[PDB]
């Protein structure tokens, strides 16, 4: 029953190339049933075109089945002389054995799909084609050549993947069938895993709430001693965040991008897109609730401040949150991954490093609200003397998410030795420091007037136009792989593009062409005291827009990068055992 | 992975007791594997033990199989002359090939069920078979599987799919003027039970609907609190509607989770029926309307627009979601609702079913909404003496309270002239009886309260003795004649029937005691509301009791529905 569909949703991304065609063959089909009028031999004709084209897909199938299990089997040689170097030796050296035997377990079951789902899809097309033609000529064939290719009489997939369950379950399961089995089963994976039903209605519910709160909020604040704004900005910021992170995991998950392969995580369990909705969903209601109490003040012995300072350390506990509950695992990894992106220099520049240094650089300003807030309880706690100033330690925060990916690139320069691309994104940040260096400078000197207040003026100009261009060159060239000149029909694009519109990329063009500029102002103008009038205005307004073209850059960054894994045919990690 | 929880879903309840017990058999090898301690001698009797267990069950499901093989061809050459004596016969003419129609996608869907038997027993013995050769280290387990399971009738026999070839043949050439795909479309047969889960967006839109009323629930108290029309009397009709429809799909889904195939019940196709999902989605949207109702009411921002528009456009719009011509929102439960209302507002010109029956017991456990509209008719008419409407009574008001009463009691004259079966109908007629003569002696008595006809005491004892049977009558009915419980082959189910499929019993001793307290609180908030009786705390004691007669009738659903499909206690099936 639609077996096109299961077999667009069970496609391994990486091999999309290499599976049956099976709907160019329905659209042959209902082409040649279209066009029938002499008929007899018309149709003789369509059908040993048809065969023609099966026995193509067919050589092509079995050669691509046949290199992977050439690869399978030098994978399996590798592994095994490692376990027996490791068994001669004798705690992570086990550990990394372990993960690189599930990988290679994971790309045998994945071959094994592709073989099945090929040979299911051979067979549902030539009944298919019986059906239309009135003839049993199609089921002659697949006997004749299906069922006798070497990728379904190859039978090394089974024994291969017995004998790694085996290796597994004695030498590092301690002669355990139960331990094994578990790390090594390779559940349904892809877009074909529905999500619990609680799930759904746990989402269901944290959206419904946080609307209803969200509409009441604003109308108390139209019909009815501490910044608000500043405060609750962040936390708006890192819901919105959360939210369209979801979407992006959705749209990964349903366009192909393998972004599982990608960021390096588990392949038999992964945290939903629904996961991060209800999670947004969840801070949001914290957060609308603390709102609400602020305004309206249920309490009057509990002060005003203390609610958003409750509702913050709330969201670090669970972020923290010792406890193996509420996505333990996911909280870990992105721990970890907080760690090393903050200590950049002393750990090797992953994808994942890189891409969490990118989303915290689109998210400067929770560190800027957290400043203005240690300001002003600092100081406050002359009116908004924070506010009204602008010092040295404003701007290094600013550039602190810029910082990290500068030397992030530097640290990928350092060990690549390759300098154009490093060399040039570290220009980019670099640009991005002149820009925010020139504009404190300025707001300084405004003050006390140093008589080269408007040199600085241009010069800060000069940086942001310099700065707007890069990152816009940047975003549009090297990080969507756009504008490249393999592109046939795909006008300003690249050759192959895995989102079903074209529309889609030109409106992300112009989205980020505009946003570039917008998030430029956004963060010269909350470094500093340029616009002390409106200027938090400004901020909060382009805050949410920066987000939002965060993650319409990670939509097209991670499926430029599952293109180039693509490339490759690399649908399973590379797990080097130390 | 976990065959147990698969097989348990994929089971046809009606088909229970005869599939595999995957579960005794892996219990008979866990308790096997651990009471091992000679050992070979101990091994080999239970060998010999567990396999005379599995040939006992495979001679089982191949004596079903056969009984249902024979039962299909009886089938389908009952059908085929059927189609034949039809075909040979040519406004009735459309009704039968209809009705044939019908008939043949049910024949195609029973041998589908029997298809998915087969495959599931044969799928439980390699399974099993394969767990006991690994638990016992031995390559024996798959040699039985072959020479017996492999080879056994059941799993031998092709007679089943050469029989849904032919009727998808016959279909589609007798049926379709020869076309396949029409004939598919109605013919194909969905996975049941829980098999299929609800859509994704159906489970988000009920959260969403659940969030949105239970925060408006809480901005409602809130505003109540803190903060010309009766509202209560105006909302409380919605509100348990609302209600209602929660705790149907809790019904709904209660059947699902025991094995009550309420979808034969009721008569609906299998192919396609409403699940809890849908029932908690139109739930939880009613509420969120109800809820902008009332918070309109109690704050009635625009000045323009009256205050009363508010409550009439939100029940306006609850009849524009129930008679909507276009094919938008469960068109296809919504027309099956409106038919079955109108058969049962038209009870005594039509042969009663299960389904007009369970709804005219739903509109007696519901007589509240049609007694509050009367009642803003009234408000309507002369209100608009100050409470001229609720300091009186009137024929129309006790009238308008017996209305479901009326329709239950000529459905049950109508089954007693049909079936011509005197006890069960004739009592049950006489059950709903009660409920005309307490209402009006009830009305009576109110109306003799207003002026000295010293007949007040002789109509009070009459309602009080004529209340104690009514509450008795029905009582004794739903614990005797709808649930079947109290019968005398209880051997392990003590005040309940023979065979009970909810995990606990003591759901049905709460059960018993609910329905008995609240049996009684019914009559006395039927009593309340069709008189003054009681002028001053009436409306708070009927709007407390009604959602507890809702429960009631919540459970009493439950329980009759099990019943049915336990039992045929309503006679609505050869
Ligand atoms: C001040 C800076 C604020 C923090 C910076 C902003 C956002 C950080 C959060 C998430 C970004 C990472 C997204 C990864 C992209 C891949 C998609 C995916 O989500 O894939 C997931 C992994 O990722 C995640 O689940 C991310 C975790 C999200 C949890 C939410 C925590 C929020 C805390 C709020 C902070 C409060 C601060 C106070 C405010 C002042 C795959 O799931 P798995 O279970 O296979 O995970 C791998 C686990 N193995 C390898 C063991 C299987
Ligand atoms: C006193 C005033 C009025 C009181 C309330 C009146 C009626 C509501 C009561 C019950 C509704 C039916 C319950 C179904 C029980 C069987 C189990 C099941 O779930 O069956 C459902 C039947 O779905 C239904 O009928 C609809 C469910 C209810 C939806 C509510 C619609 C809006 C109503 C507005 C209220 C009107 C009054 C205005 C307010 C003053 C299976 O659906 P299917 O699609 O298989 O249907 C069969 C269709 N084939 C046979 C063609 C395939
Ligand atoms: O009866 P019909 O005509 O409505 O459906 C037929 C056919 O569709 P057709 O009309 O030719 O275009 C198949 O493709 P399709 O439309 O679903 O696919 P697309 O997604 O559009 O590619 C369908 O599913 P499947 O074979 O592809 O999985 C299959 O159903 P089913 O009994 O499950 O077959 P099995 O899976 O058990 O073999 C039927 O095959 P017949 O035995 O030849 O009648
Ligand atoms: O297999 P590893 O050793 O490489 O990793 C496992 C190891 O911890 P590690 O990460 O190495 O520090 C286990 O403890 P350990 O060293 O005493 O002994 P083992 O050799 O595992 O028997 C731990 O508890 P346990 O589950 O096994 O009982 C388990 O937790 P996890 O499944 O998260 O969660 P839970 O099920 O505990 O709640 C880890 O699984 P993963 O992290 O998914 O790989
Ligand atoms: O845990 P492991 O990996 O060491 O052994 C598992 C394995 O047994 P295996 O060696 O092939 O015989 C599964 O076979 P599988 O899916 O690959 O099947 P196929 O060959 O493709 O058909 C079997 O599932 P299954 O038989 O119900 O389908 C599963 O049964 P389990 O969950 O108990 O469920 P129950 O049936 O008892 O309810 C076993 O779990 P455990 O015995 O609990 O440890
Ligand atoms: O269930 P039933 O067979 O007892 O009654 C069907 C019958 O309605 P009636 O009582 O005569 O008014 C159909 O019209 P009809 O006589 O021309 O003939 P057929 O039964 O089709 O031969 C109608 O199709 P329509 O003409 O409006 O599209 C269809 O509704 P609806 O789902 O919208 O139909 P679809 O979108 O699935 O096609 C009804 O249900 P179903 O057939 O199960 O679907
Ligand atoms: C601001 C103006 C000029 C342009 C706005 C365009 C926005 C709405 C466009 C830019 C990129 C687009 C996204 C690109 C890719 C996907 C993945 C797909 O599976 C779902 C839709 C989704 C998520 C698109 C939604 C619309 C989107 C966000
Ligand atoms: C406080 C007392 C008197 C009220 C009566 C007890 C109520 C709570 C009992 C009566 C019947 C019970 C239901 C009977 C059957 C089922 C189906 C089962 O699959 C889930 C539980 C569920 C849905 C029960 C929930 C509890 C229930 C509604």
Same mark, same amino acid.
């Given at each position: 029953?639609?077996?096109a ?7 391994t ?7 049956i ?6 659209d042959?089909?209902y082409?040649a049933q279209?066009q029938?009028?002499?008929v007899?031999?018309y149709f003789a ?11 193509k897909?067919?050589?092509?199938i ?5 290199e992977?299990?050439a690869?399978?089997?030098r ?7 490692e ?46 084609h ?18 006798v ?9 089974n ?6 369950e ?33 799930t759904?209605?746990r ?8 609307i ?28 919105e ?25 588990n ?21 609308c ?16 401040y +203390?609610?958003?300072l %409750? &509702?913050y350390?709330?969201?670090?506990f669970?972020?923290?949150?010792? /406890?193996?509950? =509420?996505? !333990? ?14 200590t950049?220099?002393?750990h ?16 400067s ?12 309880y ?5 009116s908004?003397i ?7 330690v ?8 810029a910082?990290?990916r ?7 320069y ?8 490093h ?12 820009? +925010?260096?020139?504009? %404190? &400078? ?8 140093h008589?080269? /207040?408007?040199? =600085?003026? !241009? ?5 942001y136009i310099?700065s ?21 029909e ?5 050759e ?16 980020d ?5 917008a ?27 920066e ?7 990670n ?10 894994n ?8 590379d797990?080097?055992?130390?």
């Open positions: 029953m639609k077996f569909e299961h077999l667009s949703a069970h496609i991304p990486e091999w999309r190339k290499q599976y065609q099976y709907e160019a063959f329905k042959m089909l082409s279209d029938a009028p002499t007899k031999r004709k369509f059908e040993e075109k048809f065969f023609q084209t099966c026995e897909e067919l050589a092509k079995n050669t691509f089945y046949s992977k299990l690869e399978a089997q994978r399996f040689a590798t592994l095994q002389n376990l027996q170097s490791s068994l001669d030796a004798q705690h992570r050296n086990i550990k990394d054995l372990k993960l690189a035997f599930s990988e290679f377990y994971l790309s045998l079951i994945l071959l094994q799909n592709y073989q099945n789902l090929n040979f299911t899809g051979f067979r549902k097309i030539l009944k298919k019986d059906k239309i033609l009135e003839t049993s000529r199609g089921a002659d064939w697949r006997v004749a050549h299906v069922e290719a070497p990728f379904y009489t190859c039978k090394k997939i024994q291969l993947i017995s004998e790694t085996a290796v597994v379950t004695n030498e590092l399961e301690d002669g355990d069938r139960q331990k094994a089995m578990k790390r090594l089963r390779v559940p349904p994976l892809g877009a074909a895993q529905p999500a619990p039903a609680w759904t209605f989402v269901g519910l944290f959206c419904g709430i946080f209803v709160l969200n509409i009441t909020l604003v109308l108390a604040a139209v019909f009815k001693i501490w910044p608000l704004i500043r405060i609750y900005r962040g936390g708006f910021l890192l819901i965040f959360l939210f369209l992170l979801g979407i992006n995991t959705y749209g990964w998950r349903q366009a192909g991008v393998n972004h599982v392969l990608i960021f390096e995580l392949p038999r369990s992964n945290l939903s897109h629904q996961h991060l909705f209800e999670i947004a969903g969840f801070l949001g209601i914290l957060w609730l603390s709102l609400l109490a602020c305004f309206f003040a249920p309490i009057s012995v509990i002060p005003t +203390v609610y958003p %409750a &509702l350390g709330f969201m670090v669970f972020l923290i949150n010792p /406890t193996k509950t =509420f996505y !333990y695992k996911s909280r870990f990894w992105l721990l970890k991954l907080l760690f090393r992106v903050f950049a220099p002393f090797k520049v992953g994808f994942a490093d890189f891409w969490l240094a990118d989303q915290l650089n689109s998210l300003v929770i560190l800027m609200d957290l400043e203005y807030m240690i300001c002003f600092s100081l406050e706690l002359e908004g924070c506010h009204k100033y602008t010092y040295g404003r701007a290094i925060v600013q550039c602190i998410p910082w990290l500068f030397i992030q690139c530097l640290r990928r350092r060990d690549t030795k390759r300098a154009f691309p060399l040039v994104n570290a220009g980019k940040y670099s640009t991005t420091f002149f820009m +925010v260096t020139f504009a %404190a &400078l300025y707001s300084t000197h405004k003050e006390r007037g008589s080269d /207040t408007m040199v =600085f003026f !241009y010069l800060w100009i000069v940086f310099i707007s261009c890069y990152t816009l060159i940047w975003d549009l060239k090297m990080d969507w792989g756009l504008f490249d000149k393999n592109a046939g795909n006008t300003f694009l690249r192959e593009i895995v989102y079903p519109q074209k529309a889609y990329y030109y409106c992300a063009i112009i989205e062409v505009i946003l570039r500029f998030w430029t102002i956004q963060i010269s103008i909350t470094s500093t005291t340029l616009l002390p009038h409106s200027g938090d205005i400004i901020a909060t307004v382009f805050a949410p827009l987000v939002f073209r965060r993650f319409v850059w939509f097209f960054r991670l499926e430029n990068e599952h293109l180039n693509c490339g490759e045919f690399r649908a399973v990690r797990i080097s055992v130390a």
